[PDB]
Write a protein that binds this ligand. Structure first.
Ligand code: BCB
Ligand code: BCB
Ligand code: BCB
Ligand code: BPB
Ligand code: BPB
Ligand code: MQ7
Ligand code: HEC
Ligand code: HEC
Ligand code: HEC
Ligand code: HEC
Ligand code: NS5
Ligand code: LDA
Ligand code: LDA
Ligand code: LDA
Ligand code: FE2
Lengths: 258, 273, 323, 332
């Protein structure tokens, strides 16, 4: 006789094989793939007009809503009603359903394609104990630059066309993570300030190189509401601006590299 | 068709070849020139697999195996039934993988994001080349490469290991395994952490970056931080193969004995012999 | 290129944040110090460290375990300190070689092994309590502790649950660098080739998948570091363009996508499933399957191959062949 | 650290299974040159006069031979076993029938042993056969022999270090490792498997599911047996200068048929032959040898796979003198 044998060519390990697969697909399909739909759903079509009752699949694919209790008051519930309100300055290059859209205006200011920003809260991201998290060093006076590294305050910012476009006046620090996230700079010949995320900055000893945009394009970098703090949406707006540059700053960057 | 937030990003441009000609979507999938080459190569490979499989004994997906040639054919073409199908299929796979990678580049440019993903995906393409191309070149036959079958490929890994007596003692393997294990641990820790912060449960409030770092400082005296665990993650994962490659390429061309014996360099220093 | 994804160009220093836990805030010891080279690829702050009961219990029990192992190792080189350094990798503490069944083996033949086992097990349990309790103290989920519980469960499976189920301590994992490795081949040989154990395959599938996911996830976050994708908690509660682009990268590549939260669920689950799958395999091994290859053959799964050199009858079954 | 390319490879299984030999040309060339030292066969002599059983006084084994044939045998024996020592290693200068020297009696038994190998163990040694040279390689003490405990070096022509010496206890783990191809496997496969026939090498069940009656508690073989078998197999692999896939498809180590090579069957007979040789010919020689030859438990040196093979899959690359010296077997 055999340990693990059952009637007529079944054995325990064979059943467990079937069970294991069932468990996997259950978790994958009924749990995980529904969790994946907490953002961006329900989907949008060339006008899903059926305004009186919902299509069945759209209900089945979603999970039951969950509510995050935010740390500084408020709640967010996902998934939810979140349509894109703002007018997008884009035109359909063809009638085909999955044809690309062309920008109609100036895509950096108009904020489309890679220059797009999410409609995040017009709210200042906060530290564990309520203070504004992302602030420049003139405010965060207990933060310093570390012994060894470039202090960029004073150094010029050279844009993609080799033209000095401004002077770095301050660094904005993340007080929650001890991490510099933007440089503030004076745009030469414009009497204004502008943030640039450190990711678009090549920090040298004698200058800061920025290949994302041209010198002239520092003019229209999104302005902040306040001098000494920034909102989650403003961060998106600002970051997006430079990223737009990568595809749009000159005509030839959208075209094929080869 | 479209996610609620998708339409604004779906713009023309960022291709590497062909400009507007292949710059479109089909359902959710971006196409591009490299979507077209990918599908070409997939179709060809899957056809060649189907044809080759029918000429073989069985149709059980576990027991199907398309094997490379005998060693006597060295680096030449082999008759289709006896290793040619394997040779053709290998070319179609490389066509498909490289296409898949370059397609990801195009998709990255359109979104105006980093090329880090296609970059990371070169690592497993490279490792596939180590096993099927570079190591067979150095030993002199395609017949040293691995067969395409669900279970048959394991029989190759098995015997290849035992050609060097105890493959566990291969130092490149030791490195590889250590990265495999630590990478899996770290993914659990990372995924665990994030969820632990956003989902304390019992209606208790969502926590903060500060809490993230405080947790790891408390448990193990150090926290690498938010951005850095992503860099470390990519690094640990990628080193599974980058180091493993050395252990694989060494076995045969640069070492013909058993792998435990290699540790003679240490054990047999005269100073303590 | 974004150089910030490679290393921090300008490090920042500032006052040390301490998040207050519901208990044990005084049991944090050490004074923080900052490392400049570490801070290039990480957070510069090393220390302080929390030092509770469960942590102290863990160090206590673990050190006992380590001492039992090292003493036995040294005994294996008749205490010669030079040969100890030379032969370290080859030294180990073995389970019983003789079959005593579940009998408590003599100290010279795996009693010490059994003792080291107990003390390591206690050390893991104590550390588990630390990992769990620290999460409760800071008002966090127990997600990490459950992943870790699976890791510990797997260790108990190879070390004592499987030996208990077949009823022989001889099948435990030895302590030692090469010796714990040697066990892998001995176990695989005994149970008919672990490549043919489906739970092995699942474990490997998830393990490799952890490779795939962390490479993909890590690379994804770095690729959206410019838009703040590293700040994942607030991208959950307030979706920014970082995670919008991240999701569209994948949706356009593979046809579907995740949220910034759910990808962490995927990863957590895959990590967990490496150990859960491995555990199921070991529980079935010995207990209900003796030879995994023959089991695959029984169910028509095994591949077969023509002879190359001639097939070779087992000479033991020829007529008039010796013992 | 490393060995430079290229590598000689062979195929021993179906294409795609990575089965076969992986050899470094330099190493093979060195072993080939070493083995090429096998002295050529002495010229043939015509058989004339009576049997030496009627001529000489104390001839028990080779009595069938004529005088010229017999002295050819003795000249060859000297060349193979005691080329530097000469006839006087086994004989009194003034009485060739005296048995006073221990090598004489041992040499008689060795003749009987060698003839047994070539007659009864043809399942292993085939047409090739063995002569005294196969093991001895021109010295009275063969380079590769085994005691009931592991010793270093493997070649007893090399001088041992302090740690290598058997009495030095701190070197035990290393003595053992070098017999098992550098593994940490903690088993002496010679004493376990080759010294006698008490232990079964096979450890792997021949049923998918565990048989009730053999599968729980003290009914079970301990896992140590599987470690031991592995150790034997590492040792065997190293002793022939080869790897597992010479004999096995690792898909199923336990299977014969298409999952094993003919060399595996031959290796099986080799185990049996080595056991016969140790138990019935070599081990009983502790009575006839001086204490300087014996190991620390009064054991004579005994043979393993290496004794003949010396890191080559055929001893001396298949060199044979069987036709040249009919008197060493096979015997009708
Ligand atoms: C008996 C034999 C042994 C053996 C023999 C062995 C060999 C011979 C080799 C390894 C290697 C490795 N072993 Mg290993 N091994 C490992 C772990 C590992 C891996 C970390 C490592 C790399 C595997 C690899 O190259 O994948 C390769 C993966 C590739 C190439 C992925 C390709 C992906 C491709 C680009 C995309 C494919 C796309 C699909 C076709 C698309 C279809 C998708 C659908 C959805 C549309 C562990 C954890 C253990 C344990 C626990 O004991 C172990 C034991 C053993 N190994 C045995 C001792 N091992 C490798 C190594 O690095 O050695 C140092 C290696 O060469
Ligand atoms: C040197 C190391 C090798 C190795 C050693 C190895 C071991 C030891 C084990 C596997 C296993 C597996 N290997 Mg594998 N392997 C595989 C694919 C596979 C799968 C059949 C399976 C699970 C993989 C997984 O989940 O990964 C992570 C990826 C995930 C989770 C995404 C989904 C992947 C999807 C399941 C892939 C399925 C592929 C298709 C069946 C093949 C394509 C079909 C065509 C017609 C479209 C591919 C496609 C390649 C290529 C192209 O190089 C490869 C190379 C190697 N493997 C090397 C030769 N592999 C396991 C198994 O169970 O096999 C029977 C197993 O135990
Ligand atoms: C020749 C022998 C083989 C073998 C024998 C083998 C065995 C016997 C077992 C596996 C298992 C496994 N094998 Mg595997 N194997 C694997 C991969 C794997 C793993 C994914 C899987 C799970 C083990 C694990 O992750 O532990 C890493 C994680 C561990 C060990 C958990 C540790 C957590 C712990 C809490 C840490 C605590 C440490 C403390 C801090 C320190 C305290 C210690 C001090 C006090 C002394 C690959 C990729 C390959 C390839 C490519 O060939 C392979 C080939 C082989 N394996 C050969 C077929 N393998 C396991 C399995 O899945 O079986 C079904 C298993 O039991
Ligand atoms: C797929 C799932 C994976 C997985 C998962 C998880 N694994 C976790 C968690 C999860 C979720 C935890 O939360 C926990 C942890 O805490 O992480 C930070 C942990 C663990 N995983 C460790 C080791 C490991 N995981 C392995 C494998 C897998 N894991 C599999 C692959 C392997 C392999 C591959 O063999 C190894 C060796 C330890 C670091 C730890 C236990 C310490 C202990 O039990 O105490 C034991 C007591 C001792 C005295 C030993 C001291 C030495 C060690 C190295 C500890 C030193 C730490 C010390 C604080 C340093 C001070 C210095 C400071 C001043 C600067
Ligand atoms: C350390 C590095 C890690 C790593 C990293 C990353 N991995 C990535 C990315 C990164 C970054 C992506 O960006 C990319 C992706 O999109 O993510 C969803 C991807 C992907 N990782 C896949 C498979 C995968 N990753 C593995 C391993 C690691 N990944 C390691 C761990 C393993 C194993 C075996 O471990 C597998 C099986 C696919 C799902 C996907 C490619 C799809 C493709 O290429 O489409 C195009 C090709 C096809 C759709 C089919 C092609 C059919 C050919 C022509 C005919 C078949 C031939 C074939 C050779 C026959 C084999 C038979 C078989 C039984 C032997
Ligand atoms: C028919 C035709 C002509 C079409 C033309 C167009 C064309 C080229 C189509 C291609 C068709 C093909 C070949 C489709 C096959 C697609 C493939 C390869 C699918 C493989 C999917 C698999 C198995 C993936 C394994 C990894 C896995 C388990 C992923 C699950 C979780 C996901 C989706 C992770 C991706 C993901 C990661 C990694 C994040 O970090 C992240 C961060 C923030 C938001 C979202 C994400 C996110 O989605
Ligand atoms: C040991 C390895 C030997 C060496 C070297 C030589 N001889 Fe020998 N001899 C040996 C044995 C065991 C025997 C007995 C053989 C038997 O069949 O029982 C012999 C015998 C002789 C004889 C016969 C003399 C007699 O017993 O009456 C002669 C004449 C003789 N041996 C000569 C001889 C010479 C000339 C040698 C060097 C060339 C020589 N022997 C070497 C063992 C060994
Ligand atoms: C391996 C299968 C052997 C073959 C074939 C022959 N001999 Fe041997 N011999 C062998 C061993 C393992 C030993 C023990 C070690 C030892 O030195 O005693 C021996 C021993 C001898 C001796 C004694 C030498 C001495 O101790 O000084 C002699 C004289 C001898 N062997 C002779 C001999 C002859 C003449 C052979 C062919 C007829 C022969 N041996 C074959 C192993 C093996
Ligand atoms: C031929 C010269 C061999 C080489 C090289 C290896 N093995 Fe082997 N193995 C061989 C034989 C003749 C036997 C049968 C022994 C008997 O007395 O019946 C074996 C046996 C095994 C086993 C046990 C299989 C069983 O039925 O239980 C195992 C697990 C095994 N061999 C493994 C193994 C490995 C890993 C090898 C390379 C290190 C290896 N063998 C080499 C013949 C030969
Ligand atoms: C001297 C008495 C021997 C001992 C002890 C062992 N082997 Fe041997 N082996 C010997 C000879 C003379 C030959 C013949 C060579 C030929 O041309 O046939 C062999 C052959 C083998 C083989 C076959 C190799 C091949 O076909 O390539 C194998 C696999 C083999 N021997 C293995 C083996 C093992 C495992 C031994 C210890 C158990 C062993 N042999 C001992 C002589 C002698
Ligand atoms: C009823 C009672 C009596 C019996 C039950 C007791 C019980 C529950 C026993 C359980 C035993 C278990 C689970 C045993 C498991 C053993 C295992 C899996 C051992 C695995 C690996 C061991 C290794 C790698 C040992 C290494 C040892 C050393 C390096 C020496 C020690 C020193 C160190 C510094 C450890 C470093 C380890 C590593 C991080 C480098
Ligand atoms: C990595 C090993 C995977 C082996 C897969 C073999 C599973 C066998 C179970 C098949 C299901 C049962 N049945 C009836 C079809 O035989
Ligand atoms: C062998 C390990 C098995 C791992 C299983 C993970 C597969 C992921 C499947 C993705 C399915 C996608 N989708 C949209 C069809 O649901
Ligand atoms: C039954 C075994 C299946 C193994 C896992 C296969 C992964 C499925 C991914 C293909 C689905 C692709 N799709 C529809 C999302 O685009
Ligand atoms: Fe993350």
């Amino acid at each position: 006789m055999y340990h693990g044998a059952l009637a007529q060519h079944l054995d325990i390990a064979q059943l467990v094989w079937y069970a294991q697969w069932l468990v996997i697909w259950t978790v994958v399909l009924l749990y995980l793939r529904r969790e994946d739909r907490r953002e961006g759903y329900p989907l949008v079509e060339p006008l899903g007009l059926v305004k009186l009752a919902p299509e069945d699949g759209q209900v089945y694919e979603l999970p039951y809503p969950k509510t995050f209790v935010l740390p500084h008051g408020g709640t967010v519930t996902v998934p939810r009603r979140r349509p894109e309100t703002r007018e997008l300055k884009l035109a359909q290059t063809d009638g085909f359903e999955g044809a690309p859209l062309q920008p109609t205006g100036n895509p950096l200011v108009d904020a489309v394609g890679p220059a797009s920003y999410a409609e995040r809260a017009e709210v200042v991201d906060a530290t564990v104990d309520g203070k504004a998290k992302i602030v420049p060093l003139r405010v965060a006076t207990d933060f310093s630059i570390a012994e060894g590294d470039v202090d960029p305050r004073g150094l010029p910012v050279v844009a993609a066309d080799g033209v000095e476009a401004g002077t770095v006046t301050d660094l904005w620090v993340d007080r929650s993570e001890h991490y510099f996230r933007y440089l503030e700079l004076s745009v030469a010949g414009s009497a204004r300030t502008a943030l640039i995320p450190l990711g678009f900055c090549d920090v040298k000893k004698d200058k800061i190189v920025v290949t994302s945009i041209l010198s002239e394009q520092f003019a229209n970098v999104p302005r902040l509401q306040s001098r000494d703090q920034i909102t989650l949406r403003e961060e998106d707006k600002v970051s997006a601006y430079y990223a737009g540059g990568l595809l749009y700053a000159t005509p030839e960057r959208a075209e094929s590299l080869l | 068709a479209l996610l609620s937030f998708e339409r604004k990003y779906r713009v023309r441009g960022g291709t590497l070849i062909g400009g507007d000609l292949f710059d479109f979507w089909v359902g959710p999938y971006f196409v591009g020139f490299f979507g077209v080459s990918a599908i070409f190569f997939i179709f060809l490979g899957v056809s060649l697999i189907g044809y080759a499989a029918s000429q073989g004994p069985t149709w059980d997906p576990f027991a199907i195996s398309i094997n490379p040639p005998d060693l006597k054919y060295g680096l030449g073409a082999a008759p289709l039934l006896e290793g040619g199908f394997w040779q053709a299929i290998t070319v179609c796979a490389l066509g498909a993988f490289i296409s898949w990678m370059l397609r990801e580049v195009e998709i990255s440019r359109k979104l105006g994001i980093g090329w880090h993903v296609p970059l990371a995906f070169c690592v497993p393409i490279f490792m596939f080349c180590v096993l099927q191309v570079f190591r067979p070149l150095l030993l002199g036959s395609w017949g040293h490469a691995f067969p395409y079958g669900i279970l048959s490929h394991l029989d190759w890994v098995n015997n290849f290991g035992y050609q060097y007596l105890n493959w566990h003692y291969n130092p490149g393997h030791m490195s590889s395994v250590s990265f495999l294990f630590v990478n899996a641990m770290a993914l659990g820790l990372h995924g665990g952490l994030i969820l632990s912060v956003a989902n304390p449960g019992d209606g208790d409030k969502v926590k903060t970056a500060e809490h993230e770092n405080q947790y790891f400082r408390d448990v193990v005296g150090y926290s690498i931080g938010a951005l850095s665990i992503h860099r470390l993650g990519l690094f640990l994962a990628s080193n599974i193969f980058l180091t493993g490659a050395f252990g694989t390429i060494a076995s045969g061309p640069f070492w013909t004995r058993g792998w435990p014996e290699w540790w003679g360099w240490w054990l047999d220093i005269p100073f303590w012999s | 290129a974004d150089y910030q994804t490679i290393y921090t160009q300008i490090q920042a220093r500032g006052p040390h944040i301490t998040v207050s836990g519901e208990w044990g805030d005084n049991d944090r010891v050490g004074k923080p110090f900052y490392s400049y080279w570490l801070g290039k690829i990480g957070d510069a702050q090393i220390g302080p460290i929390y030092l509770g009961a469960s942590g102290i219990a863990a160090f206590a029990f673990g050190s006992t375990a380590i001492l039992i192992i090292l003493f036995n190792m040294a005994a294996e080189v008749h205490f010669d300190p030079l040969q100890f350094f030379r032969q370290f990798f080859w030294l180990g503490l073995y389970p019983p070689k003789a079959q005593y069944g579940m009998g408590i083996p003599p100290l010279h033949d795996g009693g010490w092994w059994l003792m080291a086992g107990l003390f390591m097990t206690l050390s893991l349990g104590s550390w588990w309590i630390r990992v769990y309790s620290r999460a409760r103290a800071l008002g966090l989920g127990t997600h990490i502790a459950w992943n870790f519980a699976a890791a510990i469960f797997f260790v108990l499976c190879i070390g004592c649950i499987h030996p208990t189920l077949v009823g022989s301590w001889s099948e435990g994992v030895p302590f030692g660098i090469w010796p714990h490795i040697d066990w892998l081949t001995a176990f695989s040989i005994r149970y008919g080739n672990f490549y043919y154990c489906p739970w092995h395959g699942f474990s490997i599938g998830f393990a490799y998948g952890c490779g795939l996911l962390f490479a993909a996830h890590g690379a994804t976050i770095l690729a959206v570091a410019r838009f703040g994708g590293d700040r994942e908690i607030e991208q959950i509660t307030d979706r920014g363009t970082a995670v919008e682009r991240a999701a569209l990268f994948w949706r356009w590549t593979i046809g579907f996508n995740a949220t910034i939260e759910s990808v962490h669920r995927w990863g957590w689950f895959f990590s967990l499933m490496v150990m859960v799958s491995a555990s199921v395999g070991i529980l079935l091994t010995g207990t209900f399957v003796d030879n995994w290859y023959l089991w695959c053959v029984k169910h028509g799964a095994a591949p077969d191959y023509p002879a190359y050199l001639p097939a070779t009858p087992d000479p033991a079954s020829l007529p008039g062949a010796p013992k | 650290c490393f060995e430079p390319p290229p590598a000689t490879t062979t195929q021993t299984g179906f294409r795609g299974l990575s089965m076969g030999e992986v050899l470094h040309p330099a190493t093979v060339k060195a072993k080939k040159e070493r083995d090429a030292q096998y002295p050529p066969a002495l010229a043939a002599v015509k058989a004339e006069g009576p049997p030496v059983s009627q001529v000489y006084k104390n001839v028990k084994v080779l009595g069938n031979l004529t005088e010229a044939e017999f002295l050819r045998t003795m000249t060859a024996i000297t060349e193979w076993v005691s080329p530097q020592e000469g006839c006087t290693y086994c004989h009194d200068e003034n009485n060739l029938a005296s048995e006073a020297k221990y090598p004489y009696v041992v040499a008689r038994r060795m003749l009987e042993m060698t003839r047994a190998i070539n007659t009864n163990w043809t399942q292993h040694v085939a047409q090739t056969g063995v002569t005294c040279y196969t093991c001895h390689r021109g010295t009275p003490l063969p380079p590769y022999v085994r005691y009931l405990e592991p010793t270093l070096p493997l070649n007893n022509r090399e001088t041992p270090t302090h740690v290598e010496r058997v009495e030095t206890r701190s070197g035990y783990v290393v003595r053992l490792a070098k017999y098992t191809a550098y593994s940490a496997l903690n088993y002496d496969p010679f004493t376990m498997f080759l010294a006698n026939d008490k232990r079964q090498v096979r450890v792997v069940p021949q049923t998918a599911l565990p048989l009730v009656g053999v599968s729980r508690g003290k009914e079970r073989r301990p896992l140590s047996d599987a470690y031991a078998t592995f150790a034997l197999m590492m040792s065997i692999s190293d002793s022939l200068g080869t790897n597992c896939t010479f004999c096995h498809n690792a898909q199923t180590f336990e299977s014969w048929g298409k999952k094993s090579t003919p060399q595996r069957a031959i290796a099986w007979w080799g185990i049996r032959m080595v056991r016969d040789l140790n138990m019935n010919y070599l081990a009983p020689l502790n009575a006839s040898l001086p204490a300087s030859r014996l190991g620390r438990q009064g054991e004579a040196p005994q043979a393993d796979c290496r004794t003949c093979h010396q890191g080559v899959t055929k001893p001396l690359f298949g060199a044979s003198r069987l036709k040249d010296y009919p008197e060493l077997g096979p015997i009708k």
